[PDB]
Amino acid sequence: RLKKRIFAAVSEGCVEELRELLQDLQDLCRRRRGLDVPDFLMHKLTASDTGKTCLMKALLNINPNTKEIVRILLAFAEENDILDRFINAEYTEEAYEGQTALNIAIERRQGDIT
Amino acid sequence: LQRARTILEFEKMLPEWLRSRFRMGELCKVADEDFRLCLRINEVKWTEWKTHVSFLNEDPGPI
């Protein structure tokens, strides 16, 4: 119920729903086991089959407010020290093996996001 | 124009169980509950460089 709302809001360019969900996504991990903080949150933002993350999903659907969304997604990844492994994720499907979010930002002809 | 009139007369002398096997088209989903019978053609274009907003599938490829 929480994963599906994030992918839907990030496609249509909804900055008002994105902030309050990611704060609610943050509050759930404080009232939690607190053992594995990275390995839980990487499961919440990433589809299991195709291996696509939320940062790849935002760039495939270019909106007139995409670069404000990406800055929210990256600034959220700063306060959990997972900025390296979130920005360097790959597909696991055999038809797209190795494609990252930097291949999508160059193919969509985005200079400033790159 | 001569060969096209030939093809359309061979098609009339086929029974209905055999018309169904030789039939082009695939049911696509082009809008909200709009299913049409479509014909796919590929293209390579090197002259117009634009970013793509209109597409039915995010993930490309044949599948």
Curated annotation (Swiss-Prot), chain A:
Signal peptide: none
Tissue distribution: Expressed in keratinocytes and hair follicles.
Entry's localization field: Cell membrane; Cytoplasm; Lysosome
ANK repeat residues: 1-31, 53-81, 97-114
Subunit and partners: Homotetramer. May convert from a homotetramer to a homopentamer to allow pore dilation. Interacts with TRPV1; may form a heteromeric channel with TRPV1. Interacts with SNX11; this interaction promotes TRPV3 trafficking from the cell membrane to lysosome for degradation.
Function text: Non-selective calcium permeant cation channel. It is activated by innocuous (warm) temperatures and shows an increased response at noxious temperatures greater than 39 degrees Celsius. Activation exhibits an outward rectification. The channel pore can dilate to provide permeability to larger cations. May associate with TRPV1 and may modulate its activity. Is a negative regulator of hair growth and cycling: TRPV3-coupled signaling suppresses keratinocyte proliferation in hair follicles and induces apoptosis and premature hair follicle regression (catagen).
Sequence similarity: Belongs to the transient receptor (TC 1.A.4) family. TrpV subfamily. TRPV3 sub-subfamily.
Name this polypeptide is given: Transient receptor potential cation channel subfamily V member 3
Species in which this protein is naturally found: Mus musculus
Gene: Trpv3
Included range, full protein: 118 to 231 of 791
